[PDB]
Amino acid sequence: GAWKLQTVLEKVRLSRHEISEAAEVVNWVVEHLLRRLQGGESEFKGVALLRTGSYYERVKISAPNQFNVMFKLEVPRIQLEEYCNSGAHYFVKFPLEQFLEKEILSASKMLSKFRKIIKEEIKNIEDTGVTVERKRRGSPAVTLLISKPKEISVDIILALESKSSWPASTQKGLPISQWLGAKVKNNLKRQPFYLVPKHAKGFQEETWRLSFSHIEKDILKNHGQSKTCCEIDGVKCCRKECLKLMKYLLEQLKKKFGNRRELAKFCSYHVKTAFFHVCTQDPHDNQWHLKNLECCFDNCVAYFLQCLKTEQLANYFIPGVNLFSRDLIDKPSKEFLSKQIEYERNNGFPVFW
DNA sequence: CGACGCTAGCGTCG
DNA sequence: GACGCTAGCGTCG
Ligand SMILES: Nc1nc2c(ncn2[C@@H]2O[C@H](COP(=O)(O)OP(=O)(O)OP(=O)(O)O)[C@@H](O)[C@H]2O)c(=O)[nH]1
Numbered sequence: 001g002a003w004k005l006q007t008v009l010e011k012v013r014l015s016r017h018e019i020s021e022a023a024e025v026v027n028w029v030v031e032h033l034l035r036r037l038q039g040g041e042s043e044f045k046g047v048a049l050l051r052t053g054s055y056y057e058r059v060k061i062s063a064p065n066q067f068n069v070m071f072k073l074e075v076p077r078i079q080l081e082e083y084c085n086s087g088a089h090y091f092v093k094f095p096l097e098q099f100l101e102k103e104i105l106s107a108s109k110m111l112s113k114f115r116k117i118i119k120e121e122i123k124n125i126e127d128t129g130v131t132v133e134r135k136r137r138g139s140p141a142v143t144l145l146i147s148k149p150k151e152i153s154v155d156i157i158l159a160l161e162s163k164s165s166w167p168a169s170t171q172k173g174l175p176i177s178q179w180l181g182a183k184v185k186n187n188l189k190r191q192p193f194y195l196v197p198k199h200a201k202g203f204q205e206e207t208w209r210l211s212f213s214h215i216e217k218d219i220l221k222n223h224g225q226s227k228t229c230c231e232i233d234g235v236k237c238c239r240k241e242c243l244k245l246m247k248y249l250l251e252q253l254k255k256k257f258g259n260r261r262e263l264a265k266f267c268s269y270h271v272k273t274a275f276f277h278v279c280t281q282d283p284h285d286n287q288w289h290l291k292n293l294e295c296c297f298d299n300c301v302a303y304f305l306q307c308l309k310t311e312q313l314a315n316y317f318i319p320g321v322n323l324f325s326r327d328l329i330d331k332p333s334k335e336f337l338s339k340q341i342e343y344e345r346n347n348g349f350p351v352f353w
Numbered sequence: 354c355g356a357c358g359c360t361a362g363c364g365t366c367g
Numbered sequence: 368g369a370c371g372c373t374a375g376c377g378t379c380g
């Protein structure tokens with residue numbers, strides 16, 4: 001018996017006018033920005049643009065509130081070392097060396113000039129509407145802010161792409177084999193991984209973090225175990241729809257419940273990483289048939305619940321890293337969310353309404 | 354430039 | 368209400 005969630009999907013879906021209004025300005029800022037950066041004999045003249053994040057993978061919710069974009073530099077002969085046997089972070093050992101310090105590139109050193117350039121470049125158009133948000137320490141992305149027409153943010157991430165084989169941390173991860181098959185799985189691994197300037201502790205300046213944003217986007221585009229899943233000549237799965245609700249449930253919790261100390265740590269990547277685990281858990285399209293929507297979402301929420309209690313949410317690409325690890329997040333934070341979702345699951349999801 | 358797939362929005366319904 | 372058009376954006380060359 002319908003919750004009914006389908007209405008919830010309808011509420012969530014972006015305005016066609018909304019996107020077009022938002023869309024055209026975003027590319028315009030990025031395309032111009034890209035063009036000017038390429039022209040200048042900066043190190044970043046070589047930059048190529050990669051579009052990633054929710055909107056582009058098409059799981060954006062309510063409104064085009066935010067955009068994520070990646071600027072990738074192809075870097076050759078790269079060598080790298082793990083900071084402290086942490087799957088996410090490495091420093092790249094090593095020809096433009098201005099940013100480099102001590103034969104190892106400094107993200108902080110490298111990022112700072114990049115952010116500096118954008119700020120300089122943004123100043124040219126210098127609309128009151130367009131500005132660069134103040135740096136947040138431990139943030140690797142320069143953030144554009146557009147006050148026209150409405151408040152919206154675009155995240156620019158500097159990207160170093162390596163044609164090298166994926167790091168050892170990766171290999172156990174990404175078990176799409178049952179779901180998507182070895183051929184597909186093997187092909188994904190062949191595509192290059194990316195490096196971004198995030199640092200684990202509490203301080204660090206020259207470490208980097210791996211990004212598989214391009215890979216995640218790819219699998220989201222092609223979730224189906226069948227080639228035709230969600231195609232015109234194929235049955236429609238509800239996987240993407242399941243994801244939106246999950247994204248929506250959490251976001252509604254922060255806002256509607258109201259922000260709390262425990263709530264802040266949790267972010268949309270956790271649901272997305274969690275959702276993938278379920279897809280691995282359940283690799284058949286028949287299981288995800290649209291008419292079967294209601295159970296799956298429940299199945300989706302249940303898994304998330306288990307994770308919080310278990311406190312184990314291994315990174316999809318890196319099994320070793322636990323997103324839900326206590327050092328990453330304290331227990332009381334888990335409990336509270338757990339209960340609220342717990343409350344939510346039993347009560348028929350009023351928060352959506 | 355130019356294909357096409359995807360999705361929002363809407364008309365028809367055999 | 369399920370189909371099935373349309374328009375428009377995103378994408379890889
Ligand atoms: N496109 C992309 N963006 C990333 C990636 N990793 C981190 N970011 C960016 O990092 C920003 C937020 O920083 P987080 O990585 O989430 O770290 P955090 O623990 O939440 O702390 P904050 O930096 O303050 O947000 C986001 O806007 C992301 O765009 C990635 O693999 N791909």
Ligand SMILES: Nc1ncnc2c1ncn2[C@@H]1O[C@H](COP(=O)(O)OP(=O)(O)OP(=O)(O)O)[C@@H](O)[C@H]1O
Pocket residue numbers: 052053054055059060061066068155211212213216267268269
């Ligand atoms: N904490 C994180 N850890 C690791 N990777 C991340 C993290 N946070 C964000 N990313 C990368 O960034 C991309 C987008 O992250 P971000 O939260 O900024 O936007 P989004 O989740 O895709 O969109 P939305 O606002 O709707 O949730 C993801 O696809 C992922 O690859």
Ligand SMILES: [Mg+2]
Pocket residue numbers: 053054055066067068
């Ligand atoms: Mg996003």
Ligand SMILES: [Zn+2]
Pocket residue numbers: 223224229230231235236237238239
């Ligand atoms: Zn599907």
